[PDB]
Amino acid sequence: GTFTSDYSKYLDSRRAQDFXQWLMN
């Protein structure tokens, strides 16, 4: 299956959001 690979992409998405949020604040 692709669960772990897809979860890694989700972790990238969280990091992108955390970076976004930090830049704004």
Curated annotation (Swiss-Prot):
Expression by tissue: Secreted in the A cells of the islets of Langerhans.
Domain of life: Eukaryota
Function summary: Plays a key role in glucose metabolism and homeostasis. Regulates blood glucose by increasing gluconeogenesis and decreasing glycolysis. A counterregulatory hormone of insulin, raises plasma glucose levels in response to insulin-induced hypoglycemia. Plays an important role in initiating and maintaining hyperglycemic conditions in diabetes.
Lineage: Eukaryota, Metazoa, Chordata, Craniata, Vertebrata
Native species: Homo sapiens (Human)
Residues shown, of full length: 56 to 80 of 180
Protein name from the UniProt record: Glucagon
Induction, as annotated: Release is stimulated by hypoglycemia and inhibited by hyperglycemia, insulin, and somatostatin.
